[PDB]
Amino acid sequence: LPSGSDPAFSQPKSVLDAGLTCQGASPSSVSKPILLVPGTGTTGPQSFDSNWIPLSTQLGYTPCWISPPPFMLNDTQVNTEYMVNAITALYAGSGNNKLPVLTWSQGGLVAQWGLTFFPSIRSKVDRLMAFAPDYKGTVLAGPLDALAVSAPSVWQQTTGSALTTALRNAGGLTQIVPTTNLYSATDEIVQPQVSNSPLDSSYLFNGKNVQAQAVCGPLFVIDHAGSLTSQFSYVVGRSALRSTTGQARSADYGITDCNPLPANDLTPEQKVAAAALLAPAAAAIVAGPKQNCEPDLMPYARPFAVGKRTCSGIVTP
Amino acid sequence: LPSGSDPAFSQPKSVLDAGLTCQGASPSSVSKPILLVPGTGTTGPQSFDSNWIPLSTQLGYTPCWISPPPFMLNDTQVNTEYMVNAITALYAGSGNNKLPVLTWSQGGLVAQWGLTFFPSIRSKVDRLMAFAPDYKGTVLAGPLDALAVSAPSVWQQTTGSALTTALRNAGGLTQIVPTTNLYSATDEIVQPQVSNSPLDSSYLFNGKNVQAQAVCGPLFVIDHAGSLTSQFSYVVGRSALRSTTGQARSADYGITDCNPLPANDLTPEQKVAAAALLAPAAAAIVAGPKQNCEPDLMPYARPFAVGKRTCSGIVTP
Numbered sequence: 009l010p011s012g013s014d015p016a017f018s019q020p021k022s023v024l025d026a027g028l029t030c031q032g033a034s035p036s037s038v039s040k041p042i043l044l045v046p047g048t049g050t051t052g053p054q055s056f057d058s059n060w061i062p063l064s065t066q067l068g069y070t071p072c073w074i075s076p077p078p079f080m081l082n083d084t085q086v087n088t089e090y091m092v093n094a095i096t097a098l099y100a101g102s103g104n105n106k107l108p109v110l111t112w113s114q115g116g117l118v119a120q121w122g123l124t125f126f127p128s129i130r131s132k133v134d135r136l137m138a139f140a141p142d143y144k145g146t147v148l149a150g151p152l153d154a155l156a157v158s159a160p161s162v163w164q165q166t167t168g169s170a171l172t173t174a175l176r177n178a179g180g181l182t183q184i185v186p187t188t189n190l191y192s193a194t195d196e197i198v199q200p201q202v203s204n205s206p207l208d209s210s211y212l213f214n215g216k217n218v219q220a221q222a223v224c225g226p227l228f229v230i231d232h233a234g235s236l237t238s239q240f241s242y243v244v245g246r247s248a249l250r251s252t253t254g255q256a257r258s259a260d261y262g263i264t265d266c267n268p269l270p271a272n273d274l275t276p277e278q279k280v281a282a283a284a285l286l287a288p289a290a291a292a293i294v295a296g297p298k299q300n301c302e303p304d305l306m307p308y309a310r311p312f313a314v315g316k317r318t319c320s321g322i323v324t325p
Numbered sequence: 326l327p328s329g330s331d332p333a334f335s336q337p338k339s340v341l342d343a344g345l346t347c348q349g350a351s352p353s354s355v356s357k358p359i360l361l362v363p364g365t366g367t368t369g370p371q372s373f374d375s376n377w378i379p380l381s382t383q384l385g386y387t388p389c390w391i392s393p394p395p396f397m398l399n400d401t402q403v404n405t406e407y408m409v410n411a412i413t414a415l416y417a418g419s420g421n422n423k424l425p426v427l428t429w430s431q432g433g434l435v436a437q438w439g440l441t442f443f444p445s446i447r448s449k450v451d452r453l454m455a456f457a458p459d460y461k462g463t464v465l466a467g468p469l470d471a472l473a474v475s476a477p478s479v480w481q482q483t484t485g486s487a488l489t490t491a492l493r494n495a496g497g498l499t500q501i502v503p504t505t506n507l508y509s510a511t512d513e514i515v516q517p518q519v520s521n522s523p524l525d526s527s528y529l530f531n532g533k534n535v536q537a538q539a540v541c542g543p544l545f546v547i548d549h550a551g552s553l554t555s556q557f558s559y560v561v562g563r564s565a566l567r568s569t570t571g572q573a574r575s576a577d578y579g580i581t582d583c584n585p586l587p588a589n590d591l592t593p594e595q596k597v598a599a600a601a602l603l604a605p606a607a608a609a610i611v612a613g614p615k616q617n618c619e620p621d622l623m624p625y626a627r628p629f630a631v632g633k634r635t636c637s638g639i640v641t642p
């Protein structure tokens with residue numbers, strides 16, 4: 009694990025701060041914040057209005073979120089600047105108190121990138137609750153890269169990318185704060201996820217790794233969005249947030265929680281939006297930026313992916 | 326093109342008939358039928374309730390559709406049996422009058438497979454209006470094949486599949502009835518579609534091949550579902566269905582029709598369902614059957630894909 013100074017941000021603080029929102033509070037003065045990091049093709053509200061913004065509110069938190077533009081499609085390393093800055097702000101703004109981070113898809117990759125390369129926030133996050141995180145990226149994005157129709161962060165979320173290589177070699181496939189990873193074998197966005205083993209993209213060593221089929225059986229189906237929104241996912245997420253270990257506890261959930269429908273406590277209209285989540289995200293991706301190469305690693309990450317290829321060529325020491 | 330007898334169906338006619346229905350009519354006695362063939366992961370109503378079922382009704386047709394089970398995920402060759410049987414039935418049931426066929430995604434591949442290998446229906450279809458057809462399959466399905474998480478028809482819709490090989494070697498990449506193909510470069514399901522040329526998966530030789538960006542500009546974005554549901558798609562489809570040439574006519578549409586939102590004449594609720602179309606389809610796909618090989622070609626198609634691999638091995642003469 010890197011153990012030096014935080015790297016400088018490439019974005020100015022005013023830009024990073026403007027990407028951070030808390031519900032009914034300024035980040036500089038917020039009670040019990042939880043930081044929500046959204047998925048590719050979405051803003052914070054788009055990812056979470058139908059699920060963890062109201063659900064975390066009803067668990068006693070002030071939900072906060074970042075919306076790195078455009079729709080989490082740009083450089084995952086810049087998306088992470090938004091998250092690191094947000095943790096620093098919300099830690100201070102809540103009285104120098106650790107806060108939880110809850111993520112969907114790329115948001116989990118972002119959270120682990122921040123914890124890996126910005127050591128100052130390790131003492132500021134008490135837990136990570138990642139839904140369908142793609143720490144290894146996804147094998148499904150390869151053909152899109154080959155056609156040059158991939159946004160910056162989609163290149164970086166392809167299995168074998170320079171970014172996922174650097175994360176792995178820097179130690180980022182092992183949990184850094186107590187982490188729960190809730191994911192599903194029947195994920196049409198992030199693969200591989202089927203083995204219930206370290207091979208899965210959502211798996212972290214020493215994490216609480218919860219593949220839904222391992223608990224609910226092989227016929228249990230929640231997809232990439234269901235991983236975030238289902239009643240089963242809510243019970244695991246609530247367990248992780250409430251737990252004194254910082255990880256969800258097997259005692260808190262079981263076969264009777266294996267409900268694939270959107271969380272019981274959501275309003276009817278939140279359930280509708282939760283079910284449809286992938287459709288607006290897919291449309292935002294298709295309308296967003298596209299390039300023919302993976303964004304360069306920032307200098308702090310380059311030593312961990314020597315020999316991989318990005319826009320400027322082959323990464324050197 | 327094959328020019329002999331229709332192959333026998335593998336499914337009983339009672340099963341094929343049970344998969345066909347018409348809005349408010351029996352297929353055996355129907356005025357002005359249009360046969361709608363749905364996309365992968367859907368039934369007829371799921372594909373078209375939000376778009377061409379009401380829209381074709383307002384153009385004066387009786388919409389009819391097939392729902393090959395499960396959700397078009399099984400053998401594309403069996404799905405085509407439903408379509409061929411339906412044309413035979415609707416031709417006779419409308420007084421021995423040719424009828425139009427309108428399709429989404431795999432439905433267009435099915436229509437072209439039927440016209441290629443079942444010569445009896447060529448004189449019974451007066452035109453094909455295909456939205457985002459994948460006659461060449463899609464390059465995006467390869468990684469799912471490699472993980473053995475692909476339904477029968479997803480294997481067959483993979484670029485390079487035995488099925489797509491057989492179709493093109495039998496002559497199926499050239500239109501057989503007057504055909505309009507409406508598709509979009511910004512398709513997240515079917516690729517490649519970006520060239521506005523014969524390389525595109527939706528392209529047929531001698532067809533009316535309408536890539537939306539060629540008409541509406543490089544910044545025009547409709548996705549795989551938008552290709553079916555947009556106001557632009559409605560204007561092109563209306564032109565194709567009314568045209569005395571059997572194909573859409575460039576005189577009937579232009580830049581002022583380049584509205585990417587769901588067709589104007591849809592109800593508010595239909596527009597909502599139209600925009601969300603990919604989400605229930607993706608959910609059905611991940612819940613449906615999966616296998617580790619491409620279904621065998623039926624004997625009538627084997628001579629056209631010698632050397633390709635299916636479940637039983639390498640196709641031979």
Ligand SMILES: *[C@@H]1O[C@H](CO)[C@@H](O[C@@H]2O[C@H](CO)[C@@H](O)[C@H](O)[C@H]2NC(C)=O)[C@H](O)[C@H]1NC(C)=O
Pocket residue numbers: 077078082083
């Ligand atoms: C997404 O990322 C691109 C690439 O980093 C950003 O575009 C660059 O913006 C800087 C200044 O903001 C320019 O000097 C560069 O020339 C731009 N590069 C390209 C390739 O256009 C873009 O601003 C980012 N988008 C958002 C919404 O923040």
Ligand SMILES: *[C@@H]1O[C@H](CO)[C@@H](O[C@@H]2O[C@H](CO)[C@@H](O)[C@H](O)[C@H]2NC(C)=O)[C@H](O)[C@H]1NC(C)=O
Pocket residue numbers: 394395399400
């Ligand atoms: C999808 O296709 C499979 C394979 O053809 C069908 O499975 C067959 O179904 C019946 C028994 O239920 C028999 O013809 C075969 O023994 C089955 N084959 C296999 C490999 O299981 C299946 O029924 C189809 N699904 C639907 C919904 O029609």
Ligand SMILES: CCCC(=O)OCC(COC(=O)CCC)OC(=O)CCC
Pocket residue numbers: 049196197286287289290291293294365466479513514603604605606607610
């Ligand atoms: C043969 C059908 C394949 C399928 O269904 O999955 C493809 C995904 C990928 O495409 C994207 O752009 C990812 C954006 C989330 O598309 C979706 O599933 C999202 C829409 C429900």
